[PDB]
Amino acid sequence: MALVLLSFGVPRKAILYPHEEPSWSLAKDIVFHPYWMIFGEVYAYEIDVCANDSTLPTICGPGTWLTPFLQAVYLFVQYIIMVNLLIAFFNQ
Amino acid sequence: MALVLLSFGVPRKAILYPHEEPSWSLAKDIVFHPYWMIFGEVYAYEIDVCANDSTLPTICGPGTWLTPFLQAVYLFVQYIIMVNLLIAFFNQ
Numbered sequence: 713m714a715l716v717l718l719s720f721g722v723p724r725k726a727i728l729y730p731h732e733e734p735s736w737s738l739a740k741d742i743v744f745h746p747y748w749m750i751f752g753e754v755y756a757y758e759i760d761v762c763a764n765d766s767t768l769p770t771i772c773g774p775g776t777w778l779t780p781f782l783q784a785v786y787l788f789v790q791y792i793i794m795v796n797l798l799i800a801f802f803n804q
Numbered sequence: 805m806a807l808v809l810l811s812f813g814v815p816r817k818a819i820l821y822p823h824e825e826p827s828w829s830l831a832k833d834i835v836f837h838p839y840w841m842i843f844g845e846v847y848a849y850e851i852d853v854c855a856n857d858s859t860l861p862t863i864c865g866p867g868t869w870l871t872p873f874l875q876a877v878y879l880f881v882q883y884i885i886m887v888n889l890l891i892a893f894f895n896q
């Protein structure tokens with residue numbers, strides 16, 4: 713689950729924030745939102761950052777259209793496969 | 805699941821956006837919100853677009869009152885039946 717998380721969190725932060733010097737925030741921002749997705753928070757108005765109803769209209773730029781596709785795959789794997797695999801373990 | 809999705813996404817976009825020329829957005833807007841519903845995002849302030857607490861007060865018009873009924877059926881089928889059918893598969 714933590715691997716699937718970084719599989720998603722690192723490409724997202726890299727696509728959306730491409731002018732980042734090294735910082736401790738980079739360690740927070742690759743775990744924070746991907747973790748709250750596990751609990752069904754999809755951050756609906758932040759997925760497409762070039763949409764008109766975006767809450768993040770300023771990080772629109774090249775490649776950012778990739779992040780919906782990424783998150784669609786992430787949640788299917790994380791929210792459906794991996795959480796219910798853990799539940800299946802707990803059921804046993 | 806993708807069929808149930810378009811069963812809902814196409815009537816919604818057609819009822820709510822009736823003056824649309826052909827566009828690539830039509831391909832996004834028939835998949836985008838119906839997919840995030842699968843993960844429990846109901847877009848609560850967008851369902852009834854003629855309600856006072858609406859975030860979409862401008863797409864109010866004829867037929868738009870049909871879209872709550874549509875989405876009520878969609879999520880029951882998608883969120884409850886189809887996701888837990890997939891989970892039941894995964895459990896086996």
Ligand SMILES: CCCCCCCC/C=C/CCCCCCCC(=O)O[C@@H](COC(=O)CCCCCCCCCCCCCCC)COP(=O)([O-])OCC[N+](C)(C)C
Binds near residue numbers: 713714735738740744
């Ligand atoms: C045993 C269970 C798991 C394994 C254990 C190991 C887990 C690994 C743990 C990793 C921790 C992540 C690194 C933290 C360090 C960076 C924070 C920091 O310094 O800066 C940030 C602050 O940070 C905070 O205020 C705290 C944020 C912590 C979030 C942890 C919970 C999220 C889920 C995590 C769980 C995932 C587990 C995955 C499981 C599926 C902000 O940056 P800044 O530079 O301070 O900015 C200052 C300016 N400002 C005030 C405007 C902000």
Ligand SMILES: CCCCCCCC/C=C/CCCCCCCC(=O)O[C@@H](COC(=O)CCCCCCCCCCCCCCC)COP(=O)([O-])OCC[N+](C)(C)C
Binds near residue numbers: 772776831832
């Ligand atoms: C099912 C429902 C879908 C319909 C199906 C048919 C596919 C339809 C697809 C057709 C592809 C053509 C559409 C893109 C043309 C450019 C338009 C555009 O603005 O793009 C935008 C992004 O997107 C891109 O730049 C490219 C997106 C490609 C995604 C399609 C992958 C294949 C989908 C499955 C293939 C189907 C068959 C296989 C299925 C098993 C440009 O950018 P932006 O995001 O606006 O923001 C960035 C910054 N900006 C604003 C400054 C620019």
Ligand SMILES: CCCCCCCC/C=C/CCCCCCCC(=O)O[C@@H](COC(=O)CCCCCCCCCCCCCCC)COP(=O)([O-])OCC[N+](C)(C)C
Binds near residue numbers: 776784806827831
């Ligand atoms: C293998 C598993 C699935 C089967 C495979 C096939 C999957 C089918 C995939 C279909 C892809 C849909 C077509 C997208 C391309 C058209 C959009 C476009 O060109 O422009 C849009 C950009 O688009 C984006 O920024 C990305 C949007 C992609 C959303 C994908 C995630 C949702 C779930 C998908 C998965 C659900 C699948 C169902 C599963 C239950 C914006 O519109 P525009 O006109 O560019 O507007 C420009 C102006 N603006 C800047 C203000 C915006």
Ligand SMILES: CCCCCCCC/C=C/CCCCCCCC(=O)O[C@@H](COC(=O)CCCCCCCCCCCCCCC)COP(=O)([O-])OCC[N+](C)(C)C
Binds near residue numbers: 868869
């Ligand atoms: C169970 C709890 C419910 C009570 C039960 C009894 C049913 C009560 C129902 C009674 C029906 C009469 C009410 C509507 C009258 C018009 C009023 C109106 O403004 O309508 C609005 C919507 O709605 C419609 O336009 C029609 C809605 C019909 C829905 C009923 C389906 C059957 C439900 C089950 C039947 C029950 C028994 C079977 C059960 C197995 C029109 O306007 P708007 O949506 O605001 O926006 C549009 C644009 N505008 C603002 C510019 C106008």
Ligand SMILES: CCCCCCCC/C=C\CCCCCCCC(=O)O[C@@H](COC(=O)CCCCCCCCCCCCCCC)COP(=O)([O-])OCC[N+](C)(C)C
Binds near residue numbers: 776
């Ligand atoms: C045309 C669709 C073709 C048909 C669709 C199907 C083909 C799919 C292929 C491609 C989809 C189409 C890509 C075109 C993007 C157009 C927008 C663009 O230029 O965005 C940006 C560049 O974007 C790039 O340079 C993207 C480069 C490709 C990335 C690699 C994709 C690999 C997919 C892996 C495949 C695995 C698939 C899944 C496996 C199961 C720049 O423009 P902007 O966004 O406006 O940014 C602001 C620009 N500014 C700096 C001037 C301010």
Ligand SMILES: CCCCCCCC/C=C\CCCCCCCC(=O)O[C@@H](COC(=O)CCCCCCCCCCCCCCC)COP(=O)([O-])OCC[N+](C)(C)C
Binds near residue numbers: 865866867868
């Ligand atoms: C009164 C009802 C009594 C009982 C109803 C209950 C019985 C059901 C029957 C009917 C529901 C009642 C509809 C009333 C609509 C009133 C509002 C209206 O006119 O809206 C609009 C038109 O709306 C239409 O023209 C709708 C036409 C019916 C669509 C087909 C329904 C099929 C239901 C399938 C059944 C399957 C059931 C489920 C199967 C298990 C116009 O008004 P507006 O919204 O203000 O728009 C702005 C107008 N403007 C352009 C001037 C600015």
Ligand SMILES: C[C@@H]1CC[C@@]2(OC1)O[C@H]1C[C@H]3[C@@H]4CC=C5C[C@@H](OCCC(CO)CO)CC[C@]5(C)[C@H]4CC[C@]3(C)[C@H]1[C@@H]2C
Binds near residue numbers: 718734735736738739
């Ligand atoms: C197998 C796994 C692959 C992924 C991973 O684990 C192992 O690999 C680790 C490497 C880590 C980075 C190493 C160095 C730094 C530099 C630091 O810069 C100083 C700050 C500055 C403040 O301004 C001083 O003044 C910022 C943090 C950063 C980028 C780490 C982030 C987390 C990373 C990416 C970790 C990640 C979870």
Ligand SMILES: C[C@@H]1CC[C@@]2(OC1)O[C@H]1C[C@H]3[C@@H]4CC=C5C[C@@H](OCCC(CO)CO)CC[C@]5(C)[C@H]4CC[C@]3(C)[C@H]1[C@@H]2C
Binds near residue numbers: 810826827828830831
């Ligand atoms: C069995 C399944 C039934 C549903 C479905 O799959 C098969 O049937 C497909 C047919 C597709 C449309 C075909 C043609 C176009 C024209 C294009 O217009 C150019 C843009 C313009 C920009 O301004 C050029 O300049 C916009 C897209 C659109 C409407 C398609 C949308 C997706 C649709 C509805 C697909 C949908 C998922």
Ligand SMILES: [Ca+2]
Binds near residue numbers: 752843844
């Ligand atoms: Ca939820």
